[PDB]
Amino acid sequence: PTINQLVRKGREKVRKKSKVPALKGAPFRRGVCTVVRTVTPKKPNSALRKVAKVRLTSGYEVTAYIPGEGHNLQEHSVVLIRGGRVKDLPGVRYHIVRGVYDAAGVKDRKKSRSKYGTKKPK
Amino acid sequence: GRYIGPVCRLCRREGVKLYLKGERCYSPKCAMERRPYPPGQHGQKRARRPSDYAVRLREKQKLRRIYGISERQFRNLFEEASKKKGVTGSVFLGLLESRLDNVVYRLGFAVSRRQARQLVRHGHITVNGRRVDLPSYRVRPGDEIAVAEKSRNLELIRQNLEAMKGRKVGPWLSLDVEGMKGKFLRLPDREDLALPVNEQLVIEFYSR
Amino acid sequence: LTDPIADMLTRIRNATRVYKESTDVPASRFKEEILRILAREGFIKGYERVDVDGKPYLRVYLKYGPRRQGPDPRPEQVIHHIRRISKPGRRVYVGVKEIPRVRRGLGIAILSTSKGVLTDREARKLGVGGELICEVW
Amino acid sequence: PKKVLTGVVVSDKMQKTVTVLVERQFPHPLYGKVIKRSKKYLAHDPEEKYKLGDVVEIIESRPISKRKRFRVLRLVESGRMDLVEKYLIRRQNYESLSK
Amino acid sequence: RNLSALKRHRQSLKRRLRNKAKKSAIKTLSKKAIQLAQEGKAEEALKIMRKAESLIDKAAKGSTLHKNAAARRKSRLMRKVRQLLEAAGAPLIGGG
Amino acid sequence: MVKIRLARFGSKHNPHYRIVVTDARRKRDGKYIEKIGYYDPRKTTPDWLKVDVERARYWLSVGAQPTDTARRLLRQAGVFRQ
RNA sequence: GCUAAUCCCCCAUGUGGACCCGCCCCUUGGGGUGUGUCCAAAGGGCUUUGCCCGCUUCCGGAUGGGCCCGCGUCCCAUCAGCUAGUUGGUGGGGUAAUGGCCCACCAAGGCGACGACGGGUAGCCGGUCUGAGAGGAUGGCCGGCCACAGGGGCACUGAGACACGGGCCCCACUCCUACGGGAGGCAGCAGUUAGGAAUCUUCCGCAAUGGGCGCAAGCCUGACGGAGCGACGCCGCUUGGAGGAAGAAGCCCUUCGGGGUGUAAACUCCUGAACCCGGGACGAAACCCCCGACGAGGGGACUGACGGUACCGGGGUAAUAGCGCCGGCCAACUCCGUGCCAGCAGCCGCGGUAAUACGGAGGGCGCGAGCGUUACCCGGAUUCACUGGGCGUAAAGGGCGUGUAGGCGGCCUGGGGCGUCCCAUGUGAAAGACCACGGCUCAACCGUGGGGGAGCGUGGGAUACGCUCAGGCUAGACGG
RNA sequence: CCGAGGGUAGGGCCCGUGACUGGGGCGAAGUCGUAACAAGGUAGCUGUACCGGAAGGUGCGGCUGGAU
Ligand code: SF4
Ligand SMILES: [Mg+2]
Ligand SMILES: [Mg+2]
Ligand SMILES: [Mg+2]
Ligand SMILES: [Mg+2]
Ligand SMILES: [Mg+2]
Ligand SMILES: [Mg+2]
Ligand SMILES: [Mg+2]
Ligand SMILES: [Mg+2]
Ligand SMILES: [Mg+2]
Ligand SMILES: [Mg+2]
Ligand SMILES: [Mg+2]
Ligand SMILES: [Mg+2]
Ligand SMILES: [Mg+2]
Ligand SMILES: [Mg+2]
Ligand SMILES: [Mg+2]
Ligand SMILES: [Mg+2]
Ligand SMILES: [Mg+2]
Ligand SMILES: [Mg+2]
Ligand SMILES: [Mg+2]
Ligand SMILES: [Mg+2]
Ligand SMILES: [Mg+2]
Ligand SMILES: [Mg+2]
Ligand SMILES: [Mg+2]
Ligand SMILES: [Mg+2]
Ligand SMILES: [Mg+2]
Ligand SMILES: [Mg+2]
Ligand SMILES: [Mg+2]
Ligand SMILES: [Mg+2]
Ligand SMILES: [Mg+2]
Ligand SMILES: [Mg+2]
Ligand SMILES: [Mg+2]
Ligand SMILES: [Mg+2]
Ligand SMILES: [Mg+2]
Ligand SMILES: [Mg+2]
Ligand SMILES: [Mg+2]
Ligand SMILES: [Mg+2]
Ligand SMILES: [Mg+2]
Ligand SMILES: [Mg+2]
Ligand SMILES: [Mg+2]
Ligand SMILES: [Mg+2]
Ligand SMILES: [Mg+2]
Ligand SMILES: [Mg+2]
Ligand SMILES: [Mg+2]
Ligand SMILES: [Mg+2]
Ligand SMILES: [Mg+2]
Ligand SMILES: [Mg+2]
Ligand SMILES: [Mg+2]
Ligand SMILES: [Mg+2]
Ligand SMILES: [Mg+2]
Ligand SMILES: [Mg+2]
Ligand SMILES: [Mg+2]
Ligand SMILES: [Mg+2]
Ligand SMILES: [Mg+2]
Ligand SMILES: [Mg+2]
Ligand SMILES: [Mg+2]
Ligand SMILES: [Mg+2]
Ligand SMILES: [Mg+2]
Ligand SMILES: [Mg+2]
Ligand SMILES: [Mg+2]
Ligand SMILES: [Mg+2]
Ligand SMILES: [Mg+2]
Ligand SMILES: [Mg+2]
Ligand SMILES: [Mg+2]
Ligand SMILES: [Mg+2]
Ligand SMILES: [Mg+2]
Ligand SMILES: [Mg+2]
Ligand SMILES: [Mg+2]
Ligand SMILES: [Mg+2]
Ligand SMILES: [Mg+2]
Ligand SMILES: [Mg+2]
Ligand SMILES: [Mg+2]
Ligand SMILES: [Mg+2]
Ligand SMILES: [Mg+2]
Ligand SMILES: [Mg+2]
Ligand SMILES: [Mg+2]
Ligand SMILES: [Mg+2]
Ligand SMILES: [Mg+2]
Ligand SMILES: [Mg+2]
Ligand SMILES: [Mg+2]
Ligand SMILES: [Mg+2]
Ligand SMILES: [Mg+2]
C-alpha cells in the first residue's frame, strides 16, 4: 500500500484466539463430572477413550480427557482440569489432572508418575 | 549440588580423557585406556553420524564436565562472557579458570578438581590471608592462594605439594612450595591451555 | 511527471543495463548538482548541457567495467545500484548523527543540505545533515 | 513563553470572539511522512475588529471563558477567504457521509 | 470508642457559631449601607459603611475571613456606594 | 518546613543513608530536593561520610532544619566551624 | 448556678498593610504615592536594669500547592451525527485565584470522518519483559502523580480536607439490648470468613532512620526497623574426597563364546555438612551533661528489638536425590508384555501378533533441591512487512465512468525561513539499565563514581530540498 | 432555591434464558442415487429464474479456467 494509505488506515494488530476459553485466563479450573463415559476416536484411530463432561466453577461445562490406564471417576466427582486437547477426540480441549480432588492417580505407574498423580514407591 | 556420581563413564561418552581422578588417570587402570567407547548397553555398536546439534551439545558437556560445574553456573558465566568486551571464547575460558576451586587444582594443592573443591569447602584454602570457603569465588590478578595455617600440617596437601615440586605449573600462575602459597598473575590467554575443547562450538551451542 | 529526480535515477539505471554510451535527462539545476556528485565520485565519465529538439537536456556519459570472460561477456557495472530514498510521498531527513554508510563506505549517499548537495563523507566533513536524496554503489 | 500560534478566522458570528483555525505539520511517528493537522481556537476580540478571512496571531492568555484561553494578538493578513472556503466545503461535505 | 478527635469536633462548633455570627453582621451592615447609598443619604450610608469596613477586617484578624476575601469584600462595598451616590450626589461625610 | 535528613538505602542489615534535603512531610525514602552527601553508619569503606558543605550551608542559611543525627554528621564534617 | 487562661470582644497606638477615588511608571489585577476610611497583640519559665520559649502587624526567602495552555495517550463507524448552561456577551455571585464555576438577562452560537456523540476496556508515567534494531507486550514490587475510604449527598473546623481510624443526612447490611432503645464501617497491621487453581505471623522493638508534640527530660509512632511462614523467585552451599579388579553379587542383554550397569560397590585411608563448648558483635553517638557564651570548639555519660544471632575459636559424625525425557523435529535403545485393545500424542503421527512411539524393566540423555505440566507475554512470524510483504493463474484491482475532500506535482529568478539541517543553553528527579571501583568470605544483594540521548523551551545561524509569496518560461495540460 | 435519593410513566443498549424452529461443523466401516474430475459419457463454470427426494435439471445471457 502507499505510505499515505498507511497513514490513513495503519496496520491491524492481529489478535490471538485462546484455545482454552473455559479456563477464563486461569491455569486450571475445578469442576464436577456429570457424564463419565467412553468415546470412540476419529480416523484412522480406533479405541474407547474415557472422557468426562465437567461443569466448571467458571460457569462453563466442557468435556475433559481422562489420561492414563484406569480411573475412578463417576458422576459428582470433584475434579481439576488443565489445558490440553486430544487431537483425535474432536471437541475435547482439556485434560483432567490426575491425583487431584477425586481423580485418583494411576495404579502401579512407574514412569512419568508426575504426569499421572502417582507417588513414589519403595 | 555438583555431580557426585561415577566419573569414567564421562570420558567414555565424550571420547577423550578428562583428567577427573588424579592418580588413576595416568595408570593403565584408567577406564579410558581399557574401554574407550560410550558406557552402557550399546557402546560397542558402531556409531551413526551425529547431528550438528549433537556435535555442539557434546563440546559443551565436555567443557562443563571438565570443571565439574553445574549448568546454571556454566551458563551464567557464559552470559557474562558474551555481553563482555569482544572475544567471548577467551573470556568464558578465563572466567572459568578464575574459579577458586579450579585455581586450587591448577596450583597443585589438590590432585583433582573434585578434591580441590573439597579443600575449599572444608576451609583449608585462604585468599590473601582470609579463609575463603567458596568454590565459585572469583580469583583475580594479584591474589595469593595459600593453605591455612591449621591445615598446612595435614597429610593430603603435604603429599600433594611434594609431587608438585616435580611439576611446572602454568605460566599465568606462581607456586612457592614449602610455603604452600601461590599467586594468580593474570587470567589466561587462549593458548595457555590446550583444553580438549573447541570453545567456538560452545558459543554456537547457545546461539541457537 | 511527478518526481524529476527519481526519473533521472531511473533513466540512468535503465541505460546502464543495456550498456548505452549515454542517456539524456531533462535539464534542471538540482539535477546538475547531483550529476556533479556522480562524476567526481567516478560513477559516470561526466555530463554536458545539451539541446534536444529545442529543449535543454543533460547528456549523461555512462561507464562500465571490463569485458569479462566465460558465457555472458557483459561487463560488471560501475553503478551497481542507484536508489531513490526521499520521495514526494515520504520525505526522509537525517541529522548528521544518523547519516548512513552505504555498503561500508564502498558506496555513496547523496543528500541535500543547507550547505549544498553533498556525499555522506562530505556531509560529516561539514558537520551538517539534510534530506537523503538517494544511495548509490 | 506564552504559546503564540498563527491561524485564520473561520467564523466571526459571535460577540467579542472569533474562531481561529490553526494548522501544524509534523512527521508521522512511524511512517515518517509529513502530515497536516488542524484545530479551532475561540479567541478574544474585545473590539470586534476581526472578520472572516483575517490571518491573525493568538497568544495564550488567561481564561476569558470555558474554551476561551487565547487573545488575538495582531493581524498578519486580511481577506484570505480562500481558506475559509476550504473549511466550509469540508463541513458541508459531511451531510454526504450520513445513514 | 474514644479520641482526641472528639475534642476537635466540640471546638469546631464553638468556632462555627463564631464565624457564622461575624459573617451575618458583615452582610447586614454592608447591605444596609448600600440601600442607604441608593437613597443617598450619604452621611448615613457612609457612617454605616465604615462599621461594615471595620467588621470585615476584624474578621480577617483570624480565621473567619482570608485577607483577600476581606479586601475583595471591602472593594465591592465601597465601589457600589460610589456609583450609587453619583446619582443624587453630595458625599458628606467623607470616606474616600 | 524543609529538613535535612537521612533517607536510608542499602539493604537488610546493610544501611546506607543519603544526606538529603527534603520536605518534613515527604515519606522517608521519597523524592527529595537535593542530595548533599551520603553516610555509612558502619564505616565499612574508607569514606563512609561525605558532605557538600557549601550546599549544606545554603539550605541551613535559607531555612532547612537538620535532624538530631544529621546535625552531628554536619558537625562531624565541620559545616558549623569558625 | 460558680470559675481560670496564649479562650473571647472593646478602646488606644499604625512600623505597617488593606480598600476606594486621583495622578506616575509599567502593561491583563505589576509597581509607586497623596487624601479619606479601616485592621495588631499573649502571655509563660529561670539564675532576673537579663536571657529564654512564646505573641502581633508587614516584607523577603524557601518549601508545598491551586488554576490555565501546546503536545502525546487503547478497541468498535455493525456508534455518524452531537449540543439549552448548550457557545459567546453584559451585569453579578463565588473563591486564595482565572472561568459557565454559579445566577439574570442578551445574542445564535459551540463540536464533528484530522472521527464529534455513543458503546467497550483501562488508573497514567519512571520503568519492566522481549527483540538485531524497529517494534511488540505490560504498569505487581520500588519512586513520582492521580483517584477512592461500605454505597451516595453535603458542608463545618482549619494555612491546608469537602478529611480512611472527623461531623451531618439518605440507603443497604450487621450487631448489642434490661426490648424502652442504641452501635458499627480492615482498600491501616495481624487475623477471620466467602470466592478462587492460588497468595503469610492475631510475632519483636522503637535500638536505628523518619514523623508528631514538647524548653527539656521525654511520650506516641503495626511508618519503620527486624523476626515468622511459603523452594514463589534469584544467588550461594551440601549429600563427600583420593584409592580400589580385565572387573564380586544382583539385575539387563547375548550368536551361549560373551556384552552392560562399572571404579560403580564393597573395602583402605583422608577430609569433617551438621550438631557439642567457649568468647561474642558492627549497626550507636547524638539529643542531654561539663567548661566555654544555652554559640564555635573541646570533654563526659546512658541507650541494641534483631541477638547470645552473625561471625571467631576449639571439639566433631561420611552425612537427603530426585524429576523429565530417549520415532523425526531433538540429546539418548534394547528385551519383555500388550495385539486398532490397553494407551500415547506440541505438530507430523504411533498401536491390527518380532512396536527403538503404548506399559514395565535394563540401559541411556538432560537437568538437579529441584524437575516437569498448565496458563499467559515477546521471539522465531518479512504471518500487519516504518526498518521489512503482496494482489494474471496461490488470498488480493473497485463492473465502468465522473468528480468532492484529501495525497501528490514541470523549468527559471528572487523575498521570507514553516518543514529540514547546525551551534549554543535550559529541562529530561531519585531508583533501575550500562561501564569502572569497592562493602557483605563469593554471589545474589548493596554503596560510590562515570557516561550518554531522544523529546520539548529559548538564543544564534544555514537555505540545497520541501513549504509559501512574488515575477518570468513553454517541454505537461488545455484551446484555435 | 438547589439537593442524595425515593416514587410514577415511557424509551434505548447489552447479557442470560425459552416450547419450538433454521441451517452449520464434526463423527472407521448406514440408506438413495452418480452431479463434478477423461469430451466424466449432456463440456464445465457462471449471474439470474423456475422446477425437482437428493445431488441437480432447464431457460436466458455471459466466461474459457473447454476437448477434438
Ligand atoms: S581414570 Fe581415565 S576415564 Fe576415568 S576419569 Fe580419569 S581420565 Fe577419565
Ligand atoms: Mg491408527
Ligand atoms: Mg461446583
Ligand atoms: Mg465419589
Ligand atoms: Mg510418556
Ligand atoms: Mg569416587
Ligand atoms: Mg539468542
Ligand atoms: Mg533467539
Ligand atoms: Mg532530526
Ligand atoms: Mg439579616
Ligand atoms: Mg485571615
Ligand atoms: Mg538477616
Ligand atoms: Mg507532599
Ligand atoms: Mg484598633
Ligand atoms: Mg457549565
Ligand atoms: Mg441561566
Ligand atoms: Mg435564548
Ligand atoms: Mg483536529
Ligand atoms: Mg467499566
Ligand atoms: Mg479499572
Ligand atoms: Mg523481529
Ligand atoms: Mg502502557
Ligand atoms: Mg499486574
Ligand atoms: Mg465515592
Ligand atoms: Mg468493603
Ligand atoms: Mg462511596
Ligand atoms: Mg458515608
Ligand atoms: Mg479527598
Ligand atoms: Mg484523618
Ligand atoms: Mg478503618
Ligand atoms: Mg431516636
Ligand atoms: Mg438516638
Ligand atoms: Mg451513624
Ligand atoms: Mg491472613
Ligand atoms: Mg474454597
Ligand atoms: Mg523511634
Ligand atoms: Mg507494637
Ligand atoms: Mg571381562
Ligand atoms: Mg569389566
Ligand atoms: Mg556383574
Ligand atoms: Mg558379568
Ligand atoms: Mg555459645
Ligand atoms: Mg553497637
Ligand atoms: Mg558414602
Ligand atoms: Mg527433556
Ligand atoms: Mg532440547
Ligand atoms: Mg538422536
Ligand atoms: Mg504447550
Ligand atoms: Mg505376542
Ligand atoms: Mg506388524
Ligand atoms: Mg513382541
Ligand atoms: Mg508416543
Ligand atoms: Mg514421545
Ligand atoms: Mg517405552
Ligand atoms: Mg541451586
Ligand atoms: Mg508467539
Ligand atoms: Mg532462532
Ligand atoms: Mg513482528
Ligand atoms: Mg496470524
Ligand atoms: Mg513496507
Ligand atoms: Mg505474502
Ligand atoms: Mg483467486
Ligand atoms: Mg478492471
Ligand atoms: Mg458495485
Ligand atoms: Mg483537487
Ligand atoms: Mg501541493
Ligand atoms: Mg516542486
Ligand atoms: Mg526553522
Ligand atoms: Mg537525561
Ligand atoms: Mg534518571
Ligand atoms: Mg546501584
Ligand atoms: Mg548509579
Ligand atoms: Mg435531580
Ligand atoms: Mg432521580
Ligand atoms: Mg429516601
Ligand atoms: Mg447395510
Ligand atoms: Mg452436468
Ligand atoms: Mg460423471
Ligand atoms: Mg458432464
Ligand atoms: Mg451421465
Ligand atoms: Mg443456469
Ligand atoms: Mg425440468
Side-chain angles (χ1 to χ4, degrees), chain C residues 28 30-48:
Chain C
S28 83
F30 189 47
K31 289 173 190 189
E32 274 154 55
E33 288 315 311
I34 277 183
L35 288 182
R36 224 197 81 260
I37 299 288
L38 268 7
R40 187 189 69 105
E41 285 278 342
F43 284 128
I44 45 164
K45 298 174 185 166
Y47 71 100
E48 70 174 298

mmCIF file of all heavy atoms in Angstrom, chain C residues 28-48, unseen atoms left out:
data_model
loop_
_atom_site.group_PDB
_atom_site.id
_atom_site.type_symbol
_atom_site.label_atom_id
_atom_site.label_comp_id
_atom_site.label_asym_id
_atom_site.label_seq_id
_atom_site.Cartn_x
_atom_site.Cartn_y
_atom_site.Cartn_z
ATOM 1 N N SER C 28 17.869 20.332 -15.325
ATOM 2 C CA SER C 28 17.496 21.145 -14.176
ATOM 3 C C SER C 28 18.714 21.338 -13.283
ATOM 4 O O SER C 28 19.651 20.535 -13.295
ATOM 5 C CB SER C 28 16.341 20.517 -13.389
ATOM 6 O OG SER C 28 16.811 19.529 -12.491
ATOM 7 N N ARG C 29 18.679 22.418 -12.498
ATOM 8 C CA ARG C 29 19.830 22.781 -11.674
ATOM 9 C C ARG C 29 20.092 21.732 -10.604
ATOM 10 O O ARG C 29 21.229 21.281 -10.431
ATOM 11 C CB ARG C 29 19.615 24.157 -11.038
ATOM 12 N N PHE C 30 19.051 21.331 -9.874
ATOM 13 C CA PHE C 30 19.226 20.309 -8.847
ATOM 14 C C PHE C 30 19.791 19.023 -9.433
ATOM 15 O O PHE C 30 20.532 18.303 -8.750
ATOM 16 C CB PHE C 30 17.892 20.045 -8.148
ATOM 17 C CG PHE C 30 18.002 19.161 -6.942
ATOM 18 C CD1 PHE C 30 18.973 19.390 -5.985
ATOM 19 C CD2 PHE C 30 17.119 18.112 -6.756
ATOM 20 C CE1 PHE C 30 19.074 18.581 -4.873
ATOM 21 C CE2 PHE C 30 17.212 17.295 -5.643
ATOM 22 C CZ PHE C 30 18.192 17.533 -4.699
ATOM 23 N N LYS C 31 19.476 18.728 -10.698
ATOM 24 C CA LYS C 31 19.987 17.509 -11.314
ATOM 25 C C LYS C 31 21.453 17.643 -11.688
ATOM 26 O O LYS C 31 22.195 16.656 -11.645
ATOM 27 C CB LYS C 31 19.159 17.152 -12.544
ATOM 28 C CG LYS C 31 17.767 16.652 -12.237
ATOM 29 C CD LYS C 31 16.973 16.496 -13.519
ATOM 30 C CE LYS C 31 15.510 16.226 -13.232
ATOM 31 N NZ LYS C 31 14.789 15.862 -14.478
ATOM 32 N N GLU C 32 21.887 18.846 -12.069
ATOM 33 C CA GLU C 32 23.316 19.081 -12.239
ATOM 34 C C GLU C 32 24.058 18.818 -10.937
ATOM 35 O O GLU C 32 25.040 18.068 -10.910
ATOM 36 C CB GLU C 32 23.570 20.512 -12.724
ATOM 37 C CG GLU C 32 23.501 20.691 -14.235
ATOM 38 C CD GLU C 32 23.131 22.112 -14.640
ATOM 39 O OE1 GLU C 32 23.821 23.065 -14.215
ATOM 40 O OE2 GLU C 32 22.132 22.275 -15.370
ATOM 41 N N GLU C 33 23.576 19.401 -9.835
ATOM 42 C CA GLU C 33 24.255 19.244 -8.554
ATOM 43 C C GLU C 33 24.307 17.795 -8.100
ATOM 44 O O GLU C 33 25.132 17.454 -7.245
ATOM 45 C CB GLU C 33 23.580 20.105 -7.489
ATOM 46 C CG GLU C 33 23.837 21.581 -7.683
ATOM 47 C CD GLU C 33 25.295 21.870 -7.999
ATOM 48 O OE1 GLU C 33 26.180 21.366 -7.276
ATOM 49 O OE2 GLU C 33 25.559 22.590 -8.983
ATOM 50 N N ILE C 34 23.454 16.941 -8.651
ATOM 51 C CA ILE C 34 23.512 15.518 -8.355
ATOM 52 C C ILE C 34 24.451 14.799 -9.314
ATOM 53 O O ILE C 34 25.254 13.961 -8.894
ATOM 54 C CB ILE C 34 22.085 14.933 -8.381
ATOM 55 C CG1 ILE C 34 21.403 15.176 -7.032
ATOM 56 C CG2 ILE C 34 22.094 13.458 -8.741
ATOM 57 C CD1 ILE C 34 20.031 14.587 -6.934
ATOM 58 N N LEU C 35 24.381 15.135 -10.606
ATOM 59 C CA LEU C 35 25.354 14.611 -11.560
ATOM 60 C C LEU C 35 26.758 15.129 -11.272
ATOM 61 O O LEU C 35 27.743 14.438 -11.562
ATOM 62 C CB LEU C 35 24.939 14.970 -12.983
ATOM 63 C CG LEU C 35 23.736 14.192 -13.493
ATOM 64 C CD1 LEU C 35 23.429 14.575 -14.930
ATOM 65 C CD2 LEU C 35 23.991 12.694 -13.355
ATOM 66 N N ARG C 36 26.867 16.343 -10.724
ATOM 67 C CA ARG C 36 28.150 16.831 -10.230
ATOM 68 C C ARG C 36 28.782 15.817 -9.286
ATOM 69 O O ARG C 36 29.982 15.538 -9.369
ATOM 70 C CB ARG C 36 27.950 18.169 -9.515
ATOM 71 C CG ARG C 36 28.967 19.248 -9.844
ATOM 72 C CD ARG C 36 28.928 20.365 -8.802
ATOM 73 N NE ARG C 36 29.673 20.005 -7.597
ATOM 74 C CZ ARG C 36 29.131 19.561 -6.465
ATOM 75 N NH1 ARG C 36 27.815 19.427 -6.357
ATOM 76 N NH2 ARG C 36 29.908 19.257 -5.431
ATOM 77 N N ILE C 37 27.974 15.244 -8.391
ATOM 78 C CA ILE C 37 28.470 14.252 -7.442
ATOM 79 C C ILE C 37 28.868 12.971 -8.166
ATOM 80 O O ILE C 37 29.930 12.395 -7.909
ATOM 81 C CB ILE C 37 27.405 13.970 -6.366
ATOM 82 C CG1 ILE C 37 27.075 15.238 -5.567
ATOM 83 C CG2 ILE C 37 27.851 12.844 -5.455
ATOM 84 C CD1 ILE C 37 28.160 15.665 -4.622
ATOM 85 N N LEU C 38 28.016 12.508 -9.080
ATOM 86 C CA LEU C 38 28.229 11.207 -9.703
ATOM 87 C C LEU C 38 29.515 11.180 -10.516
ATOM 88 O O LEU C 38 30.214 10.161 -10.550
ATOM 89 C CB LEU C 38 27.029 10.848 -10.576
ATOM 90 C CG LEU C 38 25.891 10.040 -9.943
ATOM 91 C CD1 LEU C 38 26.090 9.865 -8.446
ATOM 92 C CD2 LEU C 38 24.553 10.700 -10.239
ATOM 93 N N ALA C 39 29.842 12.283 -11.187
ATOM 94 C CA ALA C 39 31.063 12.315 -11.985
ATOM 95 C C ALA C 39 32.295 12.331 -11.090
ATOM 96 O O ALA C 39 33.177 11.472 -11.216
ATOM 97 C CB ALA C 39 31.051 13.524 -12.920
ATOM 98 N N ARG C 40 32.354 13.287 -10.157
ATOM 99 C CA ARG C 40 33.526 13.438 -9.298
ATOM 100 C C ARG C 40 33.828 12.167 -8.526
ATOM 101 O O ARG C 40 34.992 11.893 -8.207
ATOM 102 C CB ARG C 40 33.310 14.602 -8.335
ATOM 103 C CG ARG C 40 34.516 14.966 -7.505
ATOM 104 C CD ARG C 40 34.126 15.965 -6.439
ATOM 105 N NE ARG C 40 33.266 15.358 -5.432
ATOM 106 C CZ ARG C 40 33.671 15.025 -4.212
ATOM 107 N NH1 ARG C 40 34.924 15.260 -3.844
ATOM 108 N NH2 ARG C 40 32.821 14.468 -3.356
ATOM 109 N N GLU C 41 32.801 11.374 -8.234
ATOM 110 C CA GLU C 41 32.936 10.133 -7.485
ATOM 111 C C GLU C 41 33.236 8.928 -8.367
ATOM 112 O O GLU C 41 33.395 7.824 -7.840
ATOM 113 C CB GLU C 41 31.659 9.882 -6.678
ATOM 114 C CG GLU C 41 31.533 10.764 -5.449
ATOM 115 C CD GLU C 41 32.316 10.217 -4.274
ATOM 116 O OE1 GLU C 41 32.650 9.010 -4.309
ATOM 117 O OE2 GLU C 41 32.594 10.986 -3.324
ATOM 118 N N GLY C 42 33.304 9.109 -9.688
ATOM 119 C CA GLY C 42 33.701 8.057 -10.600
ATOM 120 C C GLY C 42 32.568 7.279 -11.239
ATOM 121 O O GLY C 42 32.827 6.486 -12.154
ATOM 122 N N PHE C 43 31.326 7.483 -10.797
ATOM 123 C CA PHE C 43 30.226 6.650 -11.274
ATOM 124 C C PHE C 43 29.882 6.931 -12.730
ATOM 125 O O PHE C 43 29.350 6.054 -13.422
ATOM 126 C CB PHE C 43 29.007 6.853 -10.382
ATOM 127 C CG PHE C 43 29.117 6.155 -9.066
ATOM 128 C CD1 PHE C 43 28.915 6.840 -7.882
ATOM 129 C CD2 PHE C 43 29.457 4.813 -9.015
ATOM 130 C CE1 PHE C 43 29.035 6.193 -6.671
ATOM 131 C CE2 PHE C 43 29.574 4.158 -7.810
ATOM 132 C CZ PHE C 43 29.364 4.845 -6.635
ATOM 133 N N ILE C 44 30.171 8.135 -13.209
ATOM 134 C CA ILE C 44 29.954 8.494 -14.603
ATOM 135 C C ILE C 44 31.182 9.237 -15.109
ATOM 136 O O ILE C 44 31.884 9.906 -14.346
ATOM 137 C CB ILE C 44 28.683 9.353 -14.784
ATOM 138 C CG1 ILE C 44 28.626 10.448 -13.716
ATOM 139 C CG2 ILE C 44 27.438 8.480 -14.734
ATOM 140 C CD1 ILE C 44 27.651 11.568 -14.027
ATOM 141 N N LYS C 45 31.448 9.108 -16.410
ATOM 142 C CA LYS C 45 32.512 9.896 -17.020
ATOM 143 C C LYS C 45 32.222 11.388 -16.941
ATOM 144 O O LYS C 45 33.152 12.195 -17.035
ATOM 145 C CB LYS C 45 32.718 9.480 -18.479
ATOM 146 C CG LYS C 45 33.151 8.039 -18.660
ATOM 147 C CD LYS C 45 33.186 7.652 -20.122
ATOM 148 C CE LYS C 45 33.513 6.175 -20.289
ATOM 149 N NZ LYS C 45 33.228 5.678 -21.672
ATOM 150 N N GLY C 46 30.960 11.769 -16.768
ATOM 151 C CA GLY C 46 30.561 13.150 -16.627
ATOM 152 C C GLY C 46 29.306 13.425 -17.426
ATOM 153 O O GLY C 46 28.600 12.507 -17.836
ATOM 154 N N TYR C 47 29.036 14.708 -17.647
ATOM 155 C CA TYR C 47 27.859 15.127 -18.390
ATOM 156 C C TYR C 47 28.153 16.437 -19.109
ATOM 157 O O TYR C 47 29.147 17.117 -18.832
ATOM 158 C CB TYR C 47 26.650 15.293 -17.467
ATOM 159 C CG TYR C 47 26.742 16.499 -16.552
ATOM 160 C CD1 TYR C 47 26.068 17.681 -16.854
ATOM 161 C CD2 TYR C 47 27.504 16.458 -15.384
ATOM 162 C CE1 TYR C 47 26.150 18.786 -16.021
ATOM 163 C CE2 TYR C 47 27.589 17.559 -14.543
ATOM 164 C CZ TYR C 47 26.910 18.718 -14.867
ATOM 165 O OH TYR C 47 26.989 19.813 -14.036
ATOM 166 N N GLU C 48 27.267 16.787 -20.039
ATOM 167 C CA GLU C 48 27.280 18.104 -20.659
ATOM 168 C C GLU C 48 25.845 18.565 -20.856
ATOM 169 O O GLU C 48 24.927 17.751 -20.994
ATOM 170 C CB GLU C 48 28.022 18.114 -22.001
ATOM 171 C CG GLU C 48 27.302 17.380 -23.121
ATOM 172 C CD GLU C 48 27.994 17.547 -24.461
ATOM 173 O OE1 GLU C 48 28.093 18.697 -24.949
ATOM 174 O OE2 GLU C 48 28.452 16.526 -25.019
#
